[PDB]
Paper text:
CD23, also designated FcϵRII and CLEC4J, is a cell-surface receptor for the Fc domain of IgE, which regulates IgE synthesis. The extracellular portion of CD23 consists of a C-terminal C-type lectin-like domain attached to the membrane by an extended neck region.
The cow CD23 structure shows a typical C-type CRD fold, and the bound sugar ligands are well-defined. In the secondary binding site, Ser277, which forms a hydrogen bond with O6 of GlcNAc, is found in cow and mouse, but not human, CD23, and Met263, which contacts C4 of GlcNAc, is conserved in cow, mouse, and human CD23. However, Leu265 in cow CD23, which contacts the carbonyl oxygen on the GlcNAc acetamido group, is replaced by Arg in mouse and human CD23, and it is not clear whether an equivalent contact would be made. The surface near the primary binding site lacks obvious protrusions, so it is hard to define a secondary or extended binding site that would favor particular oligosaccharide ligands or occlude others.
Numbering used by the authors: 162 to 290
Write the structure that this text describes.
Protein backbone atom coordinates (compact mmCIF):
# COMPACT_ATOMS: atom_id res chain seq x y z
CA UNK A 1 0.00 0.00 0.00
CA UNK A 2 3.09 2.23 0.35
CA UNK A 3 1.55 4.20 3.24
CA UNK A 4 3.76 5.75 5.93
CA UNK A 5 4.02 8.94 7.98
CA UNK A 6 5.69 11.81 6.18
CA UNK A 7 9.45 11.33 5.58
CA UNK A 8 9.22 7.57 6.32
CA UNK A 9 9.71 4.85 3.72
CA UNK A 10 7.48 1.79 3.29
CA UNK A 11 8.64 -1.81 3.10
CA UNK A 12 6.56 -4.93 3.83
CA UNK A 13 4.15 -3.53 6.42
CA UNK A 14 6.77 -1.42 8.18
CA UNK A 15 7.82 2.18 7.80
CA UNK A 16 11.47 3.15 8.07
CA UNK A 17 13.21 6.38 8.98
CA UNK A 18 16.73 6.92 7.65
CA UNK A 19 18.04 9.32 10.25
CA UNK A 20 21.14 11.39 9.71
CA UNK A 21 23.34 13.31 12.10
CA UNK A 22 25.96 12.20 14.58
CA UNK A 23 24.48 10.34 17.54
CA UNK A 24 25.55 7.89 20.18
CA UNK A 25 23.40 4.78 20.36
CA UNK A 26 21.28 6.03 23.26
CA UNK A 27 20.79 9.36 21.50
CA UNK A 28 19.68 7.49 18.39
CA UNK A 29 17.32 5.40 20.50
CA UNK A 30 15.58 8.53 21.74
CA UNK A 31 15.74 10.23 18.35
CA UNK A 32 13.66 7.34 17.02
CA UNK A 33 11.29 7.53 19.98
CA UNK A 34 10.88 11.27 19.39
CA UNK A 35 9.71 10.36 15.87
CA UNK A 36 7.29 7.74 17.28
CA UNK A 37 9.34 4.72 16.24
CA UNK A 38 12.22 2.65 17.55
CA UNK A 39 15.66 1.83 16.27
CA UNK A 40 15.13 -0.72 13.53
CA UNK A 41 14.66 -4.42 14.14
CA UNK A 42 15.60 -6.83 11.36
CA UNK A 43 13.91 -10.18 10.90
CA UNK A 44 14.41 -11.44 7.34
CA UNK A 45 16.90 -11.32 4.47
CA UNK A 46 14.42 -9.30 2.42
CA UNK A 47 14.20 -6.66 5.14
CA UNK A 48 17.97 -6.64 5.47
CA UNK A 49 18.27 -6.24 1.70
CA UNK A 50 15.98 -3.20 1.80
CA UNK A 51 18.18 -1.68 4.52
CA UNK A 52 21.54 -2.64 3.01
CA UNK A 53 20.64 -0.95 -0.26
CA UNK A 54 19.73 2.28 1.55
CA UNK A 55 22.29 2.27 4.36
CA UNK A 56 24.55 5.16 5.25
CA UNK A 57 28.01 4.33 3.95
CA UNK A 58 29.60 5.65 7.13
CA UNK A 59 27.61 3.28 9.33
CA UNK A 60 24.35 3.53 11.21
CA UNK A 61 22.83 2.42 14.48
CA UNK A 62 20.18 -0.29 14.57
CA UNK A 63 17.89 -1.50 17.33
CA UNK A 64 19.98 -4.40 18.60
CA UNK A 65 22.04 -4.44 21.77
CA UNK A 66 23.43 -6.76 24.44
CA UNK A 67 23.47 -4.04 27.09
CA UNK A 68 21.49 -6.00 29.66
CA UNK A 69 23.25 -9.37 29.47
CA UNK A 70 26.47 -9.69 27.50
CA UNK A 71 26.05 -11.89 24.45
CA UNK A 72 22.25 -11.88 24.77
CA UNK A 73 21.15 -9.55 22.02
CA UNK A 74 17.69 -8.03 22.21
CA UNK A 75 15.79 -6.30 19.42
CA UNK A 76 13.87 -3.10 19.95
CA UNK A 77 10.78 -5.01 18.83
CA UNK A 78 11.51 -7.79 21.37
CA UNK A 79 11.01 -10.45 18.68
CA UNK A 80 13.25 -13.52 18.37
CA UNK A 81 16.79 -13.64 17.03
CA UNK A 82 15.67 -15.25 13.78
CA UNK A 83 17.90 -13.50 11.23
CA UNK A 84 21.46 -12.21 11.41
CA UNK A 85 23.76 -10.32 9.11
CA UNK A 86 26.95 -10.14 11.17
CA UNK A 87 30.13 -9.02 9.54
CA UNK A 88 32.49 -12.02 9.79
CA UNK A 89 34.01 -12.16 13.25
CA UNK A 90 31.34 -9.93 14.77
CA UNK A 91 30.05 -9.47 17.33
CA UNK A 92 33.47 -9.46 18.96
CA UNK A 93 32.86 -7.31 22.08
CA UNK A 94 36.07 -5.48 21.29
CA UNK A 95 37.97 -3.00 23.41
CA UNK A 96 36.26 -2.17 26.67
CA UNK A 97 33.04 -3.82 25.52
CA UNK A 98 30.77 -3.26 22.54
CA UNK A 99 27.12 -3.56 23.39
CA UNK A 100 25.26 -1.66 20.66
CA UNK A 101 24.89 -2.84 17.09
CA UNK A 102 25.45 -0.85 13.93
CA UNK A 103 25.25 -1.56 10.26
CA UNK A 104 28.51 -0.94 8.51
CA UNK A 105 28.37 0.87 5.18
CA UNK A 106 27.89 -2.57 3.59
CA UNK A 107 24.85 -3.37 5.74
CA UNK A 108 26.79 -6.02 7.68
CA UNK A 109 26.37 -5.78 11.42
CA UNK A 110 29.08 -4.89 13.91
CA UNK A 111 28.89 -4.47 17.64
CA UNK A 112 30.32 -1.11 18.63
CA UNK A 113 30.92 0.97 21.70
CA UNK A 114 27.55 2.43 22.60
CA UNK A 115 29.16 5.84 23.00
CA UNK A 116 30.57 5.99 19.49
CA UNK A 117 29.01 8.69 17.33
CA UNK A 118 27.59 7.48 14.03
CA UNK A 119 26.13 9.72 11.36
CA UNK A 120 23.28 7.37 10.50
CA UNK A 121 20.59 5.63 12.48
CA UNK A 122 17.51 3.79 11.27
CA UNK A 123 14.09 3.68 12.91
CA UNK A 124 11.09 1.56 12.14
CA UNK A 125 7.42 1.41 13.02
CA UNK A 126 4.49 -0.79 12.15
CA UNK A 127 2.75 0.42 9.00
CA UNK A 128 -1.02 0.83 8.93
CA UNK A 129 -1.37 -1.55 5.96
C1 LIG B 1 35.62 -2.38 10.42
C2 LIG B 1 34.59 -1.88 11.40
O1 LIG B 1 33.71 -2.61 11.84
N1 LIG B 1 34.69 -0.59 11.74
C3 LIG B 1 33.78 0.05 12.68
C4 LIG B 1 34.32 0.01 14.10
O2 LIG B 1 34.51 -1.36 14.44
C5 LIG B 1 35.48 -1.53 15.43
C6 LIG B 1 35.13 -2.88 16.05
O3 LIG B 1 33.82 -2.91 16.58
C7 LIG B 1 35.23 -3.96 15.00
O4 LIG B 1 34.89 -5.20 15.59
C8 LIG B 1 36.66 -4.01 14.46
C9 LIG B 1 36.84 -5.05 13.37
O5 LIG B 1 38.21 -5.06 12.96
O6 LIG B 1 36.98 -2.71 13.89
C10 LIG B 1 36.87 -1.61 14.78
O7 LIG B 1 37.79 -1.69 15.82
O8 LIG B 1 33.40 0.59 14.98
C11 LIG B 1 33.21 1.99 14.72
C12 LIG B 1 32.28 2.50 15.80
O9 LIG B 1 32.89 2.48 17.08
C13 LIG B 1 32.65 2.19 13.32
O10 LIG B 1 32.61 3.58 13.04
C14 LIG B 1 33.51 1.49 12.27
O11 LIG B 1 32.84 1.51 11.02
CA1 LIG C 1 28.69 -6.89 24.07
CA1 LIG D 1 32.82 -5.17 16.98
Amino acid sequence: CNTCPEAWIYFQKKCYYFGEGAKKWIQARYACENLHGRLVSIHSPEEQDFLTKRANWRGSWIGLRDLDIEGEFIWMDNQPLDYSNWQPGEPNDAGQGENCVMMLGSGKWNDAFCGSELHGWVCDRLATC
